[PDB]
Amino acid sequence: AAAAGPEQVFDVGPRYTNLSYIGEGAYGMVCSAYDNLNKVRVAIKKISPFEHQTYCQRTLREIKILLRFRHENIIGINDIIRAPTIEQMKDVYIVQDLMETDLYKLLKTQHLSNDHICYFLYQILRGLKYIHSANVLHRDLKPSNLLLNTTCDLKICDFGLARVADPDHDHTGFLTEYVATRWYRAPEIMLNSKGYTKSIDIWSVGCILAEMLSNRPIFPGKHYLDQLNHILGILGSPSQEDLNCIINLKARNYLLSLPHKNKVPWNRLFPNADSKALDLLDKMLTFNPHKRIEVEQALAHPYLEQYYDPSDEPIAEAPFKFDMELDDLPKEKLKELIFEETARFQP
Structure with missing residues (x-):
């Protein structure tokens, strides 16, 4: 015994x-x-x-x-x-x-009503508001890191790749290796970013919202560069203004070498989707990180108005800091x- x-x-x-x-x-x-x-x-x-x-x-x-x-x-x-x-x-x-299931398993088998999509997105952003108010980034948001119970309460898990935000140290070279899940990576990751700003998480939430609308990943790249070509296929070629933000020469010249593509409108990809959901999707999946919507603005968007209540959306008591560096x-x-x-x- x-x-x-x-x-x-x-x-x-x-x-x-x-x-x-x-x-x-x-x-x-x-x-x-x-x-x-x-x-x-x-x-x-x-x-x-x-x-x-x-x-x-x-x-x-x-x-x-x-x-x-x-x-x-x-x-x-x-x-x-x-x-x-x-x-x-x-x-x-x-x-x-x-927790009974996760969003990855759920999307393999079930189609979601618009009320379920709205409420799941609300809970993701409410959680994310708190994480971001403590100056932390998740960095690996995807459907399998979103756990659900039978009453549809949602919880974010897996903080194994999380970091404290550090925008002053975000810049890097073209084609720098990255550890997080390829399909939910923001375009700036393949171009000039180490993923040390809040806007990378918002991109991932954008991807998740598209996936909730259609039951399949929107940017299913097979390898590091194919990921970028999926994104440009839908969003279209970046403008001059957006290109001028990319100072990194190798990245800029790669982008200039590609043939011109026009934006595919979202209502062509998602004809059954609520119109307000597509407007929010569009602000989350913005090529330029500095024009991408922030978590508080997303919560205040019309799509979420039946839930939005800033007095019931707590922030952290103080910012988070690692004393000493684990790397x-x-x-x-x-x-x-x-x-x-x-x-x-x-x-």
Whole structure:
């Protein structure tokens, strides 16, 4: 009579009973379980990250942010289970609210009414307003990072690529490599941006809105440059004014080498869509990042007027800041920090 386990080792102690296997995404296994102290069901992710410094970094980054954020539309951490000492710590179990599906799975099977689209978009932007008010960027918004329950409450998860906004350090070269999901990448990422400003998240929300309207990705590039050619195929060739903002010579001259394309109007792509939804889509999917709509303006758009209420759309109490920088640290110091962050949940 000892440690529990389906398929392998999943020891989660006095509190959590009645496990059932759910899947294995990026790094570690997921299971449901019965929280005895609160008498609800919950999700538990086993993370085993100490053997690769990249997983350690995403794990700490995420733990710090989620512990400080407190918002209805952002996933919480209810509990963290690890060994009592640093030498015995090989795994970490993260306990979160159980959510029945996500938007990726939902869009594979269901078509959405206009009321569902409106309300889902509202909740995304309400969550995003809070994230942006703390000066944080998500950077990997996509349908599988939007979790849903059976009553249609929406929560944003997966802050593994999140960063503090830093517009003064956004510029980079043409064709610089990028880690986030290709189909939801803003055009400036392939041209001149590292993705350190708020406008990259708004682009991704734009993509998600199009996907909710039609059940398929709007810019399904097969590789790094094909992504850019999908975008230009719909939005058309950028104007002189927009081109003059791109100082980077290699990017500008690539863009000048392409044949002229006219904008495809949105109502040709989405003939059943509400007219106000297409007007918002258009302001989100703007080629120039500086003319792209901000989160507060999107919330105040007519499409969302039955929900918009700024007194019920909280902002963070203070801006978020990493004291010390996680990109320049070895896997042994990271382990020790994960240990320290997770101390408050120890009996």
